[PDB]
Amino acid sequence: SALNKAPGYQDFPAYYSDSAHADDQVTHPDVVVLEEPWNGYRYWAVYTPNVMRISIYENPSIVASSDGVHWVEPEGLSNPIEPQPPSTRYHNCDADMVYNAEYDAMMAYWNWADDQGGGVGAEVRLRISYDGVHWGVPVTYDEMTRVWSKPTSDAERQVADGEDDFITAIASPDRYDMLSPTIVYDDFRDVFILWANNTGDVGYQNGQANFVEMRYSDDGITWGEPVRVNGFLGLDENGQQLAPWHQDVQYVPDLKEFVCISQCFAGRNPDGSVLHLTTSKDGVNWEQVGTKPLLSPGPDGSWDDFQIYRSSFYYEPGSSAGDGTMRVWYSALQKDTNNKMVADSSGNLTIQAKSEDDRIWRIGYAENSFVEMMRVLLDDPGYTT
Ligand SMILES: C[C@@H]1O[C@@H](O[C@@H]2[C@@H](O[C@H]3O[C@H](CO)[C@H](O)[C@H](O)[C@H]3O)[C@@H](O)[C@@H](CO)O[C@H]2O)[C@@H](O)[C@H](O)[C@@H]1O
Ligand SMILES: [Ca+2]
Ligand SMILES: [Ca+2]
Ligand SMILES: [Ca+2]
Ligand SMILES: [Ca+2]
């Protein structure tokens, strides 16, 4: 196996309470792993609750951990960090978070859509935090200039964190052309990079017409014009082209390259999607690693038996160069779940799925040696970095 899935899944809290849906359904994690603790913890994650049929609960939420396994809501934090929309016309999705070393602050991005055709389109929005508890607009950010000035005291390391306290990073008049934004700070060129999937004004059924675009920014706040990446995905084991749905990118210093885990598909839409691995020296020009999937749905009846959904990763360096560990927080869905018993996070059959749970959404974990992963992907038992 390219990655070894951990048994069960991880417990993430979801704020919602809805009688027609099992609690604590969640997707699309984005994890930040640090060398040293930030506001008490070395692991920070943003994620969104989600259920079938209604997207209104899909609101950026934060947890922290000391281990990447057991997640807690920091003391004083109220999830979601971005409020529930006022109606089902609108929904949030697709969170991704970066640690900004210069400001010693987290930058949490997400996608907001007006889903009404002929509506206003969509936006990539941003809330920043200094303390891990309050997420919003820095008090030394000037909305007129869009400049985030570095704090010059502890008192300036504060945010406004009300319901309207976000930054619009990007706007588009189409609804679905900036899906799954993923941000990396390139410390060579000294620029923020954001990759997103362009599904036009169509979305989930756009399919093989999907393509990824990148944008550049000096600060992470104001972004330039998009340009298409090249070579993002390749052929699968049948020789069939893969198309993007959702993705996470990392710059990996130990590998001297950008690495991306892509939730992708060979058919008409992301049903049954798998993960593939793709890499790039520059962020622009990519090549898929092997023909084989990095992660696939589990067997019938498993919590991940429908599709693998958007996943986040960290390359943990080893003691030797080029010999690290791939750590993957993967989201997934189970099919055919209405009124059925489903697994808890320990893998025990203790949860009753509810009447409108057509599927169940959870976040779990998988891991492998980077070298062993590459050996499986490339069908090369002797690969070494
Ligand atoms: C309930 C329904 O939910 C959303 O549509 C889902 C769709 O959601 C994904 O794709 C749309 C674009 O088509 C957005 O990017 C979402 O952030 C994605 O999660 C898929 O799940 C398809 C699967 O068949 O089902 C649609 O109903 C939302 O766009 C709708 O407005 C509505 O809220
Ligand atoms: Ca999404
Ligand atoms: Ca990320
Ligand atoms: Ca091209
Ligand atoms: Ca190609």
For 246-308, where are the alpha helices, taking DSSP H only?
none
Own/partner long-range contacts of 35-40 (Cβ < 8 Å, ≥24 apart): 38/99, 38/104, 38/106, 38/132, 39/64, 39/74, 39/131, 39/132, 39/133, 40/64, 40/74, 40/132
**Approach to solving:** X-ray
Whether the Cβ atoms of residue 22 and residue 32 lie closer than 8 Å to each other: no
> Which numbered atom of ligand 1 lies nearest the CA of 202?
13
Distance in Å, CA 205 to ligand 1 centroid: 10
Choose which residue among 55, 89, 94 to substitute to test ligand 1 binding: the one with the highest number of ligand atoms within 8 A of its C-beta: 55
Q: Of the bound ligands, which one is closest to the alpha carbon of residue 271?
A: 1
Which residues pair with residue 352 across a beta bridge?
341
Please give the Cα distance from 289 to 283 (Å, whole number): 15
- Residue 380, classified by CB atoms within 10 Å of its CB into exposed (0-12), middle (13-18) or buried (19+), is exposed
Q: Of the bound ligands, which one is closest to the alpha carbon of residue 232?
A: 5
Please give the Cα distance from 270 to 240 (Å, whole number): 15
Please give the Cα distance from 49 to 29 (Å, whole number): 10
Could you list the beta-strand ranges (E) of 203-256.
211-217, 227-228, 243-252
Distance in Å, CA 284 to ligand 5 centroid: 14
Residue 375, amino acid: R
Buried b (16+ CB within 10 A) or exposed e, 85-118: beeeebbbbbbbbbbeeebebbbbbbbbbbeeee
Distance in Å, CA 213 to ligand 5 centroid: 16
Q: Whose CA is nearest to atom 30 of ligand 1?
A: 115
Whether the Cβ atoms of residue 330 and residue 303 lie closer than 8 Å to each other: no
Distance in Å, CA 376 to ligand 3 centroid: 24
What lines the ligand 1 site, CB under 6 Å? 53-55, 91, 93, 115, 176, 179, 203-204
Could you list the beta-strand ranges (E) of 66-154.
90-100, 105-114, 122-129, 137-138, 141-142, 147-148
Buried b (16+ CB within 10 A) or exposed e, 194-210: bbbbbbeeebeebbeeb
Q: Of the bound ligands, which one is closest to the alpha carbon of residue 241?
A: 5
Distance in Å, CA 268 to ligand 5 centroid: 19
How far, CA to CA in Å, does 230 sit from each of 13, 198, 212, 261, 288? 38, 14, 9, 16, 11
Q: How many Cα atoms occupy the beta-carbon half-sphere of 178 within 13 Å?
A: 30
- Which candidate, 234, 283, 243, 280, places its Cα nearest to that of 263? 243
Helix (H) or strand (E) holding 377: helix 370-378
Residues whose beta carbons lie less than 5 angstroms from ion ligand 5: 234
How far, CA to CA in Å, does 320 sit from each of 225, 254, 373? 40, 10, 17
Structure letter (DSSP) for residue 285: B
| Cis status of the peptide bond prior to 173, with omega within 30 of 0 | no
Which residues pair with residue 365 across a beta bridge?
329
Distance in Å, CA 232 to ligand 5 centroid: 8
Q: Of the bound ligands, which one is closest to the alpha carbon of residue 270?
A: 1
How far, CA to CA in Å, does 135 sit from each of 139, 197, 309? 11, 26, 26
Q: Reduce the DSSP state of residue 180 to 3 states and report it.
A: strand
- Domain-by-domain residue ranges, the chain? 1-385
